[PDB]
Design a protein around this nucleic acid. Structure first.
Ligand SMILES: [Mg+2]
Ligand SMILES: [Mg+2]
Ligand SMILES: [Mg+2]
Ligand SMILES: [Mg+2]
Ligand SMILES: [Mg+2]
Ligand SMILES: [Mg+2]
Ligand SMILES: [Mg+2]
Ligand SMILES: [Mg+2]
Ligand SMILES: [Mg+2]
Ligand SMILES: [Mg+2]
Length: 1105
RNA sequence: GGUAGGAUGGCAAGAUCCUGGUAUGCUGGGGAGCCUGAAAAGGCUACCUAGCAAGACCCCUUCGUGGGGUCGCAUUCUUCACCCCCUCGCGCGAGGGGGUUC
DNA sequence: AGCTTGGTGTATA
DNA sequence: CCAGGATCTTGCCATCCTACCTCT
DNA sequence: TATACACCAAGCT
């Protein structure tokens, strides 16, 4: 029964959270909080230690599978070529460990007269070379690999280092020659640097290159006299590689023409569009005001801009010799940031970049492409545009000219500007046609060419369609469930309010220094772009620019060990590892030899330098601190100082603490994407407005409504001085959403001005009619929120993960143990029997009328019966026969000939037995490996109730009391628990606390707890629902920096978190009135039993039907 | 005007994936050197080789516990049930995507 | 002889 | 780690559109 | 505006 009410929706997006409020209004006064809920989500992250999202881990695993499958196919095709040549591939076994290396060495060194020996060594060498071929730019062809210098400079430096280290000069000094020589001279030497945790020097230090392996192949071919066609076939088989590709479904669509893909920046239509649009936005002085350029002025400037081979027309040049303006400042509306010494008029106007690159490539390589040079001078702009589009879109996964194949290879080697622009090629051609004909700008050209009005906006995505961004998708899924539920409860909202991750309350000095930072960044990047384009890099990436900057800043030396480095052997090490949240911000990037990076791994700089011998921590710190500010460089003075401090702080960390930087891109994207989808919902549902306000407006509105989280939720003081922030209670997201429902644009401007004035600095109330009206309308909001928190209606819930997907086991395969049948059997050895038939036979041997195994790990269950025979259904194992066992007394499954421990528990099944006045409880912890080996990872299976065989790790490592009670027939399954199920202990709270939980519950009497795991057969891990771990972690952080600022409650919280309540199942489920609460999207517990997970009481839940 | 939102282009700083690779690592099979040993078998350091989620679907084939091909760790209430949407698109049982109020 | 803490291994760059 | 493609965020400059808000 | 779990061992009642 839907009852319609006037209500507003408040949306607080977050990185790992979203606050959602449905607040019913009357006039502009809030009448009732219909629903306030903080939903805690994972941001797409499944494993916090891995750091990466589930989508990212799946993509990496899928691409590892794809790489290995194509490697299989490539090596099989090489085997076929070797069999056609008569060359014997290296066998799988019964060969010397250095047979391939010595074959490579001997074939490089001397001609082998015996044809049989020559073919065998050639096949050994080539098959091994294909297995270990080194690295190539994946976008380069095999012909491009052949055109590289041979060997690479990395291998020449390695060769010089090896000759100096070993006092011998091998000729010609190939990788195979040096490796075979060193594997014989120093047995047990490691070839490449590896991840560290005795430590001897490796043979090589830098990454092996495919041109080095190719040069060794050429040397072997020249020494052995192989025919050139044979060498060519072997090269194309060894260095075969799939070209990287872009799926076209990953490319966005033109908003005006959704059937068309967005155009590449390489397109000549986009180049023409850029020039014409920029000229259409310039203004000329007219009677102390600005006027648009006339049609003739526009055509003159546009023809001067298009007719360019190099970017040499500045805005001052355009004003002075092209426009014939009497003064340089007469040209107004220049699209550049204003700076000193007339920088805006010193900046370059756009040009046809693709035509300039193609003309440069033609004039440089007229020998290689004379037919293409003639065709390019022959054809017109439309045919050139079609050719350029084909050349720029050839990289799509899914030429009209009969060009010679060498010329086609040269053009595919030609580099064009990358990146997609907003419009399609057809749209750009039409829009540019309208502006060049009518003299209009982009807006009027869009109106004319596409028949739209001044109110036109691009089409927005709907609520049901995702972005592919994990944080945004989590926020969107939660919001759309909330909105669907709230719409069927109370109708559509009157208005929707969304908070955007933007901030404007900044000082003029802050604005000036950020402007100077942007100016210095642009000047340095333009310069470094110029020398990199002179060096041979067409379109430098941000990481290219960072690499050039750090190579200039450290004089082409490693930042860690000081070894000399170059462009191709350097690595950009994340000082804070990516798996520990480490960002790509340039203070987190260190230029590194590569050996230092590979040895450092995930370990922090200090925890690696402390025990290492290659680098010195203090030497690295002093080299960073000894950097001096030049006259002109990338950073400003303040930026250079803060950059050195950030780098030093990143080197100094001795623990795997997460990244210092709190990135807000995902929050901003979530806010903008959810706003676009809420605008779509409002168009489809007649919502009057979807307003947006900044975060600081919401914080200032909380300040001026006297909404304190510690007062609202009666949270005790954690600091001796001042009050705790909003983040101590996780309900603050829902509070922020409620506050967001009150905001109007005028009061938002007033509170933004007020907060900006207080940053630029007790206190003074804001002064505006909108502030007065909003304050009088939302005077009662404080009392309403106090009553809502008093009746505990603001819920904190995590969405459940019920799908049985993810990692089936741990990634480390383990060797099996062995145990003889006739020997004495302990309980743990009986629990570790791999084969289910042998396990069941031994189970029946220990207890005949039995389905489960009832043992203790330390008890000697069976004696050393010297004539014991285990009779399977396909074999009889005598007392001498050896039974395969899992290596450890923990849950594990057989995977690919080895043993793998089970992964995290998917769920726990709750079993209750005993009398009704005092029942006994136990958990059956079920992993995805249990479901996999039980065959339950299939269609039509309820994973929480489907039976698990006794040989599964779940039933093997259940508690002995649970096993005896299930076998005796008294224990029945009454429910299930997943990580994230809320345990509401009731108004009485937790009554079985002892030791540390009692001391935590004196100051934080939490009745709502979240299941986080099941750490053994008798325990469940619970953390409080309403309390944040980041607040406790920053308590621990500020405790070191400040003297005893934490209160008793602050210290108690700081030591309770993060392990929290490692609780006993018997001591948790013994609380009467404890409820396992599963909530609807509005934060309301699901009590009616339907086809969605519902709340249940472990005391009174019936056994499963 | 002032604030806010949106378009396009530029510039700056970032975030998320996607495609293709490399070098290790683990397990199985090996073994170059060293050591402990030998009437008495295993280590250590490397290197070689195969596999690297369990598995699923398709086609083989000059028949087999194999060969080849495409996939499989995302979309957090699994499965079931109901309702909605796009697509197997004749008012279809279906392939995906969404929602289910306490 | 059971619960409470403490430490640590887990596939990587 | 490597190259390099796609999607997007935030801030500033230029232009165009929208909406409301505030003081003479 | 964010980020460990399942196993293995001590430890004082
Ligand atoms: Mg917020
Ligand atoms: Mg490969
Ligand atoms: Mg290789
Ligand atoms: Mg090596
Ligand atoms: Mg690193
Ligand atoms: Mg929030
Ligand atoms: Mg290997
Ligand atoms: Mg090896
Ligand atoms: Mg496989
Ligand atoms: Mg579902």
């Amino acid at each position: 029964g839907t009852v319609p009410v006037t209500w507003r929706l408040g949306v607080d997006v977050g990185e790992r959270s979203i606050g959602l409020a449905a607040v019913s209004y009357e006039e502009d006064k809030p009448k009732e909080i219909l629903a306030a809920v903080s939903w805690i989500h994972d941001g797409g992250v499944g494993d916090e230690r891995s750091g990466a999202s589930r989508l990212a881990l799946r993509g990496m695993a899928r691409r590892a599978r794809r790489l290995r499958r194509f490697r299989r196919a490539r090596l099989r095709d090489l085997d076929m070529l070797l069999s056609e040549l008569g060359w014997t591939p290296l066998p799988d076994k019964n060969v010397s460990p250095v047979d391939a290396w010595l074959a490579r060495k001997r074939l490089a060194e001397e001609y082998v007269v015996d044809e049989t020996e020559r073919r065998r060594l050639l096949g050994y060498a080539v098959s091994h070379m294909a297995r270990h071929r080194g690295w190539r730019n994946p976008w380069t062809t095999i012909k491009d690999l052949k055109n590289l210098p041979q060997p690479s400079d990395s291998w020449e430096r390695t060769r010089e280092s090896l000759e100096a280290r070993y006092s011998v000069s091998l000729e010609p000094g190939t990788v195979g020659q040096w490796a075979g020589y060193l594997l014989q001279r120093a047995p047990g030497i490691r070839l490449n640097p590896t991840q560290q945790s005795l430590s001897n020097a490796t043979a090589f230090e830098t990454r092996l290159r495919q041109e080095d392996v190719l040069w060794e192949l050429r040397c072997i071919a020249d020494v052995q006299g192989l025919p050139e066609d044979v060498v060519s076939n072997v090269i194309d088989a060894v260095f075969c590689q799939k070209r990287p590709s872009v799926p076209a479904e990953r490319i966005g669509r033109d908003p005006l023409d959704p059937s068309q893909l967005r155009a590449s920046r390489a397109c000549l239509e986009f180049q023409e569009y850029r020039i014409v649009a920029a000229v259409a936005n310039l203004r000329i002085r007219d009677g102390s005001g600005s006027r648009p350029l006339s049609l003739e002025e526009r055509n003159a400037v546009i023809e001067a801009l298009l007719a360019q081979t190099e970017r040499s027309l500045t805005w001052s040049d355009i004003a002075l010799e092209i426009l014939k303006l009497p003064n340089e400042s007469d040209l107004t509306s220049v699209p550049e940031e204003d700076g000193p010494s007339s920088l805006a008029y010193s900046q370059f106007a756009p040009f046809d970049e693709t035509s300039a690159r193609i003309a440069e490539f033609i004039a440089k390589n007229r020998r290689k492409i004379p037919t293409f040079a003639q065709w390019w001078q022959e054809q017109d702009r439309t045919s050139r545009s079609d050719l350029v589009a084909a050349l720029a879109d050839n990289s799509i996964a899914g030429l009209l000219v009969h060009l010679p194949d060498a010329e086609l290879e040269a053009l595919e080697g030609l580099a064009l500007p990358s990146g997609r622009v907003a419009y399609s090629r057809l749209t750009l051609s039409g829009l540019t046609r309208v502006m060049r004909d009518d003299g209009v700008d982009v807006h009027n050209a869009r109106k004319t060419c596409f028949g739209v009005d001044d109110n036109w906006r691009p089409p927005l995505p709907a609520l049901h369609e995702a972005t592919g961004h994990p944080v945004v998708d989590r926020n969107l899924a939660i919001l759309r469930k909330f909105l669907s539920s709230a719409t069927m409860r109370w109708g559509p909202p009157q208005s929707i309010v969304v908070e955007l991750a933007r901030g404007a309350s900044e000082s003029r000095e802050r604005q000036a220094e950020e402007e100077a930072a942007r100016r210095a960044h642009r000047k340095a990047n333009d310069r470094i772009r110029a020398e990199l384009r002179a060096s041979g890099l067409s379109d430098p990436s941000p990481a290219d620019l960072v690499r050039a900057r750090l190579l200039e800043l450290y004089d082409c030396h490693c930042m860690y060990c000081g070894a000399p480095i170059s462009w191709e052997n350097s690595e950009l090490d994340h000082i804070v590892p990516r798996t520990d949240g480490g960002s790509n911000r340039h203070e987190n990037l260190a230029i590194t030899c590569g050996a230092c990076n590979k040895e450092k791994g995930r370990r922090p700089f200090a925890s690696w330098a402390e025990t290492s011998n290659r680098v010195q921590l203090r030497d690295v710190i002093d080299r960073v601190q000894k950097l001096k500010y030049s006259g002109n460089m990338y950073w400003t003075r303040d930026e250079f100082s803060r950059y050195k401090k950030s780098v030093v702080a990143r080197l100094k960390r001795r623990t795997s603490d997460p990244e210092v930087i709190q990135s807000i891109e995902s929050t901003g994207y979530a806010a903008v994407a959810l706003r676009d989808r809420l605008l779509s919902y409002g168009e489809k549902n007649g919502v009057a407005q979807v307003a947006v306000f900044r975060g600081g407006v919401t914080a200032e509105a909380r300040r001026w409504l006297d909404i304190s989280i510690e007062r609202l939720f009666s949270r005790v003081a954690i600091f001796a001085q001042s009050t705790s922030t909003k983040r101590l209670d996780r309900r603050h997201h829902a509070v922020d959403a409620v506050v967001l429902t009150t905001l109007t644009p005028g009061v938002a401007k007033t509170l933004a001005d007020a907060r900006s004035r207080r940053v630029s600095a007790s206190t003074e109330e804001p002064q505006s009619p909108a502030y007065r009206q909003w304050k009088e309308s939302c005077s009662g909001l404080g009392d309403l929120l106090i009553s809502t928190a008093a009746r505990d209606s603001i819920a904190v819930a995590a969405p459940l993960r019920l799908r049985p997907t993810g990692a089936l086991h741990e990634e480390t395969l383990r060797a099996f143990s062995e145990h003889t049948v006739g020997a004495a059997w302990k309980g743990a050895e009986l629990r570790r029997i791999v084969e289910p038939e042998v396990y069941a036979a031994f189970l029946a041997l220990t207890d005949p009328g039995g389905r489960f195994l009832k043992v203790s790990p330390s008890e000697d269950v069976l004696p050393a019966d010297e004539n014991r025979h285990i009779v399977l259904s396909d074999r009889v194992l005598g007392p001498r026969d050896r039974v395969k066992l899992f290596p450890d007394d923990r849950g594990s499954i057989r995977v690919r000939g080895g043993a793998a421990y089970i992964a995290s528990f998917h769920h726990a099944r709750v079993f209750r037995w005993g009398s009704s006045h005092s029942p006994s409880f136990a958990l059956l912890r079920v992993s995805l490996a249990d479901l996999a080996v039980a065959g339950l990872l299939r269609d039509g299976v309820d994973v929480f109730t489907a039976e698990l065989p006794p040989w599964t790790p779940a039933w093997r490592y259940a508690s002995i009391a649970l096993v005896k009670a299930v076998e005796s027939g008294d224990a029945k399954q009454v429910g299930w628990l997943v990580p994230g199920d809320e345990l509401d202990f009731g108004p009485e709270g937790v009554t079985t606390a002892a030791g540390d939980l009692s001391m935590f519950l004196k100051y934080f009497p939490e009745r709502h707890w979240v299941v986080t795991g099941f750490e053994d057969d008798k325990r469940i891990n619970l953390k409080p629902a309403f309390l944040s771990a980041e607040q406790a972690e920053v308590l621990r952080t500020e405790r070191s920096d400040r003297p005893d600022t934490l209160t008793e409650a602050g210290e108690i919280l700081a030591q309770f978190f993060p392990r929290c309540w490692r609780a006993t199942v018997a001591k948790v489920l013994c609380h009467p009135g404890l409820t396992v609460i599963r909530r609807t999207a509005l934060g309301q517990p699901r009590w009616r039993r339907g086809h969605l997970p519902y709340s249940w009481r472990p005391w009174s839940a019936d056994p499963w039907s």
